[PDB]
Amino acid sequence: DLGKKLLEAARAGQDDEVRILLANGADVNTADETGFTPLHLAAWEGHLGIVEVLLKNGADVNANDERGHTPLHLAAYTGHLEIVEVLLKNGAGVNATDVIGTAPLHLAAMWGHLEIVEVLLKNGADVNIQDKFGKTAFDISIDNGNEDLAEILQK
């Protein structure tokens, strides 16, 4: 119902409709079939203003989808630096791990998002974290052919 409209409005970037739906009772943390909340989708699509609106309306900054991804996971994956910064300023768990043991630092390094890597480390990213395959952000950097980025992620 309203929750379904809120998810799509956040995905499509309709920030006026997001506010309208929230003003009319829409659950800010509505989750779709796969566990994505409006904050997940806005982070994935790169809608900074909607991220800020949802957070001002009680959104769960650390909501987990069915795979354990938080909004910070999706922002780091898609390379949205401004959203990464805002999420961290709003208490995002910098070292959250998904069901495979992957943290946001793994995903930023997977695609060579250097600025995002620095921000995560600046906010306490732990480089020793290993996913279930034993791969640290350092190792992931090597496997994905991101060598110069592996100097900052040693150990």
Author numbering: 13 to 167
Can I see the authors' text?
In this paper, we present a strategy to fuse specific, high-affinity protein binders to obtain multivalent or multispecific scaffolds of predetermined geometry. DARPins are used as building blocks to confer the desired specificity to the construct. A series of rigid connector modules replacing the DARPin capping repeats allow to combine the individual DARPin domains in such a way that their distance and angle can be altered to test different geometries, bringing the binding partners of the DARPins into a defined spatial arrangement. The two helices are not just joined end-to-end, but instead the two domains are made to overlap in such a way that the joining helix is stabilized by contacts with the domain cores along its entire length.
To facilitate crystallization of the unliganded constructs, we used the internal repeats of DARPin D12. This DARPin was originally selected to recognize the V3 loop of human immunodeficiency virus envelope glycoprotein gp120. In the context of DARPin-β-lactamase fusions, we observed that the paratope of this DARPin has a high propensity to form major crystal contacts, leading to crystal formation under a wide variety of conditions. The unfused DARPin D12 has been added as reference. In the crystal of unliganded DARPin D12, the paratope-paratope interaction is split into two interfaces (i.e., interacting with different molecules) of 498/473 A2 and 405/438 Å2 of surface buried, equivalent to 71% of all crystal contacts made by D12. Additional interfaces are provided by capping repeats and by bridging Ca2+ ions. In the absence of its ligand, the interactions of DARPin D12 are weak enough for constructs containing this DARPin to remain monomeric during expression and purification. Upon crystallization, the paratope-paratope interactions of this DARPin are strong enough to form prominent crystal contacts under a wide variety of conditions. In summary, DARPin D12 can form five predominant types of interaction with its paratope in arrangements with and without local symmetry, compatible with numerous crystal forms, involving both non-polar and charge interactions, while it shows no dimer formation in solution in any fusion protein under the conditions tested.
